[PDB]
Paper text:
Hydroxynitrile lyase from Linum usitatissimum (LuHNL) is an enzyme involved in the catabolism of cyanogenic glycosides to release hydrogen cyanide upon tissue damage. This enzyme strictly conserves the substrate- and NAD(H)-binding domains of Zn2+-containing alcohol dehydrogenase (ADH); however, there is no evidence suggesting that LuHNL possesses ADH activity. Herein, we determined the ligand-free 3D structure of LuHNL and its complex with acetone cyanohydrin and (R)-2-butanone cyanohydrin using X-ray crystallography. Moreover, the structures and mutagenesis analysis reveal a novel reaction mechanism for cyanohydrin decomposition involving the cyano-zinc complex and hydrogen-bonded interaction of the hydroxyl group of cyanohydrin with Glu323/Thr65 and H2O/Lys162 of LuHNL.
Because of the low sequence identity of LuHNL with structures of known proteins, the initial structure model of ligand-free LuHNL (LuHNL_lig_free) was built using the BALBES program. The crystal belongs to the monoclinic space group P21 with unit-cell parameters a = 94.12 Å, b = 52.18, c = 168.51; α = 90.00, β = 95.01, γ = 90.00. The Rwork and Rfree values of the refined coordinate are 0.156 and 0.183 at 1.48 Å as shown in Table S1 (Section 1). The electron density of NAD+ was observed in the crystal without the addition of exogenous NAD+ during enzyme crystallization or soaking of the crystal in an NAD+ solution before X-ray diffraction. The NAD+ molecule was bound to the β11α6β12 fold, a classic binding domain for ADP, which is consistent with the fingerprint for ADP binding that identified from the amino acid sequence of LuHNL. Furthermore, two classical tetra-coordinated complexes of Zn2+ ions were observed. One was bonded to Cys115, Cys118, Cys121, and Cys 129 at a distance of 2.3 to 2.4 Å, and the second Zn2+ complex formed bonds with Cys63, His85, Cys199, and one molecule of water at a distance of 2.0 to 2.4 Å. Beyond the water molecule that bonded to the second Zn2+ ion, a glycerol molecule was trapped via hydrogen bond interaction with the water molecule and residues of Thr111, Lys162, Glu323, and Thr349, which implies that the second Zn2+ area is the catalytic site of LuHNL. In addition, a hexa-coordinated complex of Mg2+ ion was observed on the enzyme surface that bonded with residues of Glu52, Glu140, and four molecules of water at 2.0 to 2.2 Å. In addition, the binding geometry of glycerol, a pseudosubstrate that bound in the catalytic pocket of ligand-free LuHNL structure (LuHNL-lig-free) suggests that a hydroxyl group cannot replace the water molecule to bond with catalytic Zn2+, even in the absence of a nitrile group.
Numbering used by the authors:
A (entry chain A): 15 to 422
B (entry chain B): 9 to 422
Amino acid sequence: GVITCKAIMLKEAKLPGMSYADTVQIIDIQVDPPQNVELRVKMLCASVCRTDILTIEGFMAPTQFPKINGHEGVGIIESMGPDTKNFKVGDVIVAPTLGECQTCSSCRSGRTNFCQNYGANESALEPDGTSRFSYIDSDGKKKLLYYKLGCSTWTQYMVVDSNYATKLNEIAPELPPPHGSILSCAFATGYGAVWLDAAVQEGDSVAIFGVGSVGISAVIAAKELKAKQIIVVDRNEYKLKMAMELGATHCINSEKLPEGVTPSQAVRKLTPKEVGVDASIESSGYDVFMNEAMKAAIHGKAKTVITGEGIYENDRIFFDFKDFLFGGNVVGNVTGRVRIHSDFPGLLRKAQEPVIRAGMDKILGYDAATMKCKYEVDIREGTPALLKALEEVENVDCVKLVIKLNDY
Amino acid sequence: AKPDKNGVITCKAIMLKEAKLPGMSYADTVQIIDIQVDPPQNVELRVKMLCASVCRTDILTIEGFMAPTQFPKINGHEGVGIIESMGPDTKNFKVGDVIVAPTLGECQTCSSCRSGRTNFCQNYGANESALEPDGTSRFSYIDSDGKKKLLYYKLGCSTWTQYMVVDSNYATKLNEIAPELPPPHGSILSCAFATGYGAVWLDAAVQEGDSVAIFGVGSVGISAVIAAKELKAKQIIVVDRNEYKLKMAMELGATHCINSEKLPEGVTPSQAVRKLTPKEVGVDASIESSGYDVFMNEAMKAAIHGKAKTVITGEGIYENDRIFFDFKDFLFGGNVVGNVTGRVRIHSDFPGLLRKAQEPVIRAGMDKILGYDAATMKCKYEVDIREGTPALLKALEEVENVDCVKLVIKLNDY
Ligand SMILES: NC(=O)c1ccc[n+]([C@@H]2O[C@H](COP(=O)([O-])OP(=O)(O)OC[C@H]3O[C@@H](n4cnc5c(N)ncnc54)[C@H](O)[C@@H]3O)[C@@H](O)[C@H]2O)c1
Ligand SMILES: NC(=O)c1ccc[n+]([C@@H]2O[C@H](COP(=O)([O-])OP(=O)(O)OC[C@H]3O[C@@H](n4cnc5c(N)ncnc54)[C@H](O)[C@@H]3O)[C@@H](O)[C@H]2O)c1
Ligand SMILES: [Mg+2]
Ligand SMILES: [Mg+2]
Ligand SMILES: [Zn+2]
Ligand SMILES: [Zn+2]
Ligand SMILES: [Zn+2]
Ligand SMILES: [Zn+2]
């Protein structure tokens, strides 16, 4: 029942000064059959979240190497543990970081996805300390591989606890793989941050700090929800122009501001009476933008939704104290607050509307005739092609790199 | 006091000459002096103050908090008084009304007011200039050289004065709902009590059966305990290093107490709080009322991820004017808000709070915070502006006494 397949292994953290070649390799791994309520999933593609690059740099993994990378991806159920309910072999699933038990006081509040019973699997292991992944090293020893959290997506086959899975095939049978892959993290996060957490209403103003794939998904949501004003802030003019094309109304290049004008000052100057924005979204990973987004919000009334991640000194972020006391309102957000049972089905339906699909196509640079994305690499084409693709994640026009894992 | 023929009142006020920086004394910067108080203009109230009461933010103001250029000033934002006169444009107030005038007004028409969920009014926000909008001040003094000099406010007014002037858009009346309320209770309703009570009642929206953590049980945190008890919280966990105020908190409804200076080896305040909750899930509502930057982060971490709100009331003079949060715990369900005056809106919420303050258990708790003696109308720690600068300097040092919860500054006969 053991599958042998290709996976992207991280040997150790890539610390500053080290290369991708030093730590990243495509290898053959062994994937054990699923136990209990687990799904073993034939992956179609992964797509590269900035958090995947932070993971390569050791984020949230002080001991959890070697590992198979990745949390953003989509695939098809190949087999299931004997206790599984509510899934079938052949279902198309995504498996984000947080499940939804629907019975804990967090689920029952109706206002959060931080489920007390199906929270983030920070151990990067099965609950017994084992892993469904292993490999045979050059010494010929069988060695354990850690997951990312509850699973790894940079692999032709993964195993995940079905309490974290949600299916695509009943609502969206024709959804292309790359779209399913960004729905598993990037698109849910940006869209949800605006729709659910900031709770943007028709006529609200929105500021979005960082228009990578997450920020652009937030623009798409703000436009869909008929925000009066959608302000985008970034150093990347290509991605600012893409945000404007998908509905942003005002753009600010933060690296072209005068030295004495902060990003929050620049945002506030666009709003009437310098009052700030109804909803402030941070989607950059830049600790400075977390404090700027907090400042750009209308004091008291508006919520600042922090989605960014990064490797911060002492794992700490900072806020300017006076501006925080006098009306700051900041929340941490994982996966857009999009609960896998209560919210994700509705987001999946929305994603199929033509303007939403067009925006996802633009994020991906998707060609529906060829099913190819602008920036794509196939796990079957070897380690050198992958290392080059990982470097090209920093290209100005690379919004979302796709890793193809199997035939579609 | 009686105005001169030009309407100017001469009275006592507590002047701050400059910031009391580290190593400086209260004697270096704090003096009771005679000041002139101009007549009110426009929609202003000129108010005969009954008493001020000492908020930790008053002491921060003495240390220069939020006042890089706004010295010399008259201190104080917590206090109560009686309208003596009004500007010609004033609406909805009478001479003789008893008022308090906190930092935020409530226009009722801006998008923040109409949200129903904040007190941060866009039209009547904090007056950080510590001046009138034209750059004048209603306060001046004659210095030792014989020259008339300007005095800054705290924000929109100063309370440490026998007579204050404030824009009536920041005032709310006590005498219709609570005519018998004593002055020091009115004073703590203007800041300390509203802040702790409102942080629990309005901002954290504590429900019957919720668990609550309160970091710092000074007057603000003890007011939070009183609210959490009134709202029938299941669990009220208080954290501090002052054993006297932890014990007062327990007497007024706290269920568990933690001494942050006596924790086991390897245990943070947030861990200590979570250890008292089922499966170490933390609390439904986390209140910070200490001014200790460490406790703002511990309060964030004690809250149930995602579900709970952490309400930050604390103030201080911090390294690089910033505070910090542990990033992984913050991203994975942190929820932190800045709170001024408990989110208690002066028109929409204050009347209800003033009615609650008259209920017997709530009044008993206010009496305990103040150490109030109804027979003498005197508080346990009280100093009178009419009795000289030396007595004031001693009282300011005695703010640090373990059993000083709320120092009252009497300003006028009651
Ligand atoms: N909370 C979650 O569930 C969640 C989900 C998705 C991604 N993330 C995090 O959210 C962030 C956004 O994800 P992404 O994949 O879109 O990342 P990304 O790297 O693709 O895009 C980030 C954008 O922010 C901009 N930015 C970063 N630093 C900047 C600076 N110094 N000046 C100006 N602009 C700056 C970049 O130019 C870029 O356009 C990342 O930090 C990622 O790790 C978190
Ligand atoms: N946001 C507002 O509207 C508002 C209103 C009132 C007060 N404040 C601020 O809120 C805080 C509470 O005000 P207060 O007048 O009750 O203050 P206070 O100083 O009388 O009481 C603070 C309490 O916190 C405890 N604390 C402080 N540092 C500590 C440490 N290192 N370890 C353990 N415990 C510690 C103290 O021992 C004390 O019991 C202050 O910072 C004050 O400046 C703000
Ligand atoms: Mg398992
Ligand atoms: Mg005025
Ligand atoms: Zn991600
Ligand atoms: Zn749950
Ligand atoms: Zn105060
Ligand atoms: Zn208003």
